[PDB]
Amino acid sequence: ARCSRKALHVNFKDMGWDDWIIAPLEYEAFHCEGLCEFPLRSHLEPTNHAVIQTLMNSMDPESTPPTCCVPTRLSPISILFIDSANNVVYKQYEDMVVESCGCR
């Protein structure tokens, strides 16, 4: 399976954070996972470096591992929570949800 976005269901209650987080207690974060193989296709938006490393790995897997499938665009979510002063706070957290994956 080639590098792509797969599901990551986050349950905050499962993390024990239902004591500060009010809402939401679940959300879809997604993860990237998969092979990064030559040639690195357009949707994977490789850097020059990823291409070189990919070539090098396959000609000498000792010199360097293959490149990695990781998020390349992310979007935020807001969380309603209790802070240490006991204020209720509604805050946008950046970089919370995988929108696209690629080889880096």
Partner: protein, 85 residues
Amino acid sequence: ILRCKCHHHCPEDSVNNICSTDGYCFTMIEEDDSGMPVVTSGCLGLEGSDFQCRDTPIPHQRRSIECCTERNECNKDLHPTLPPL
């Protein structure tokens, strides 16, 4: 904005065996451990293409790739050949 064919390996933000790119269409031929020519095709982006659109010899693998931008689906008419022994 160039459209290309893929058949082996082709992305699910793009149905009908067509992908779009700002770079190049490519066709590649590869000798799978079996040793049958396994050909693939698709889209390469602009960054990295100087390095991807040419062959680099890999041990224990026979591979050749070619790229094109002359027209939509120009990669249908690319026929790379394997490097000789």
